[PDB]
PDB file of all heavy atoms in Angstrom:
ATOM      1  N   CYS C 409     113.513 -77.408 205.285  1.00  0.00           N
ATOM      2  CA  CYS C 409     112.667 -78.447 204.493  1.00  0.00           C
ATOM      3  C   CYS C 409     112.975 -79.777 205.315  1.00  0.00           C
ATOM      4  O   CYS C 409     114.056 -80.173 205.418  1.00  0.00           O
ATOM      5  CB  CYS C 409     112.959 -78.572 203.127  1.00  0.00           C
ATOM      6  SG  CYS C 409     112.222 -80.017 202.362  1.00  0.00           S
ATOM      7  N   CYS C 412     115.350 -82.720 203.106  1.00  0.00           N
ATOM      8  CA  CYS C 412     116.610 -82.568 202.594  1.00  0.00           C
ATOM      9  C   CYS C 412     117.557 -81.586 203.431  1.00  0.00           C
ATOM     10  O   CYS C 412     118.640 -81.456 203.010  1.00  0.00           O
ATOM     11  CB  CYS C 412     116.495 -82.006 201.089  1.00  0.00           C
ATOM     12  SG  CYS C 412     115.846 -80.330 200.956  1.00  0.00           S
ATOM     13  N   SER C 414     117.271 -78.099 203.840  1.00  0.00           N
ATOM     14  CA  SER C 414     117.595 -77.093 202.954  1.00  0.00           C
ATOM     15  C   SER C 414     116.802 -75.895 203.550  1.00  0.00           C
ATOM     16  O   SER C 414     115.685 -76.027 204.168  1.00  0.00           O
ATOM     17  CB  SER C 414     117.165 -77.363 201.614  1.00  0.00           C
ATOM     18  OG  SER C 414     117.867 -78.405 200.957  1.00  0.00           O
ATOM     19  N   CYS C 437     110.040 -76.455 198.464  1.00  0.00           N
ATOM     20  CA  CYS C 437     111.523 -76.375 198.584  1.00  0.00           C
ATOM     21  C   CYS C 437     112.079 -76.232 197.122  1.00  0.00           C
ATOM     22  O   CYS C 437     111.655 -76.913 196.198  1.00  0.00           O
ATOM     23  CB  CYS C 437     112.038 -77.678 199.178  1.00  0.00           C
ATOM     24  SG  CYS C 437     113.809 -77.656 199.550  1.00  0.00           S
ATOM     25  N   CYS C 440     114.395 -79.896 196.387  1.00  0.00           N
ATOM     26  CA  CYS C 440     113.706 -81.191 196.115  1.00  0.00           C
ATOM     27  C   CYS C 440     112.412 -81.107 195.646  1.00  0.00           C
ATOM     28  O   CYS C 440     111.728 -82.180 195.378  1.00  0.00           O
ATOM     29  CB  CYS C 440     113.811 -82.061 197.429  1.00  0.00           C
ATOM     30  SG  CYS C 440     112.831 -81.204 198.744  1.00  0.00           S
TER      31      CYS C 440
HETATM   32 ZN1   ZN E2564     113.612 -79.802 200.504  1.00  0.00          ZN
END
Side-chain angles (χ1 to χ4, degrees):
Chain C
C409 174
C412 66
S414 296
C437 190
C440 61

